[PDB]
Design a protein around this ligand. Structure first.
Ligand SMILES: OC[C@@]1(O)OC[C@@H](O)[C@@H](O)[C@@H]1O
Ligand SMILES: OC[C@@]1(O)OC[C@@H](O)[C@@H](O)[C@@H]1O
Ligand SMILES: OC[C@@]1(O)OC[C@@H](O)[C@@H](O)[C@@H]1O
Ligand SMILES: OC[C@@]1(O)OC[C@@H](O)[C@@H](O)[C@@H]1O
Ligand SMILES: OC[C@@]1(O)OC[C@@H](O)[C@@H](O)[C@@H]1O
Ligand SMILES: OC[C@@]1(O)OC[C@@H](O)[C@@H](O)[C@@H]1O
Lengths: 88, 88, 88
């Protein structure tokens, strides 16, 4: 079936749910006022996530895996880009 | 194999581990004094979870997936019910 | 594909990413100065993780599953050992 990963922050809260479905990962977002589709859209068969809130900034790390390759995607306030993570 | 998801809160801590096994999700609970089987029992092949503790209240969201359908289950102090999440 | 689980703590942050790949779980670690391979290496086809930071101590629980058996692995400052979790 589809595979999901979830994270949340604050007291509203904000929630992010990532779904790997048919080799693509998409993102659904809640900030207290309805679910919406987030900016994150990248390939992957499996997803995990962690996040940490510091001051006014949310930092999110999404680990997207296809085959034996895992790509880290980073949100630090300015869109999603690949991070330095490697699996070694 | 079976697939799990875990969350924890406080300093004891309380831990919740959700296991999707043979199309059913069950819940094991630790509150500092032994593991026990929790109230959560719903269908699903895949599970993720997030939780947030505010004051005296734990809020838990469990995302249960079968095929391409994901159901959000909500704990807000008074049993588990379906939440408004949709995958779009 | 490979399956991952992630957790993080503090403001640096420290991040731990567990990967189940070909029946083995390994751990990659970030403490602010590059990724490295962690001490955790145990069998499993599926992994989840939760952690909680209290004072100067990180506590990590990794749930490693093969078939219908889930083993809890505990970090409490002094290496990884099996915890009391059972699935019942
Ligand atoms: O729209 C809200 C948003 O910016 O929140 C942070 C990330 O989750 C983004 O992908 C998302 O679009
Ligand atoms: O700011 C991005 C970054 O440095 O954040 C910490 C880790 O997630 C790294 O892999 C990543 O490149
Ligand atoms: O028994 C403890 C309990 O109420 O804690 C909150 C939820 O995890 C419930 O499913 C669980 O039964
Ligand atoms: O109180 C329940 C609820 O509003 O909590 C926030 C989100 O999890 C929603 O999908 C959900 O319906
Ligand atoms: O090296 C850092 C380390 O000690 O951090 C705590 C655990 O994640 C360990 O497996 C890891 O080796
Ligand atoms: O200190 C280890 C331990 O007591 O921590 C809390 C739970 O993770 C238990 O299963 C585990 O044996």
């Amino acid at each position: 079936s589809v595979q999901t990963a979830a994270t949340s922050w604050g007291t509203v809260p904000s929630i992010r749910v990532y779904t790997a479905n048919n080799g693509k990962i998409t993102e659904r977002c809640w900030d207290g006022k309805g679910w919406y589709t987030g900016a994150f859209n990248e390939p992957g068969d499996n997803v995990s996530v962690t996040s940490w809130l510091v001051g006014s900034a949310i930092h999110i790390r999404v680990y997207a895996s296809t085959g034996t390759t895992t790509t880290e995607w980073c949100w630090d306030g300015n869109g999603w880009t690949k991070g330095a993570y490697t699996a070694t």
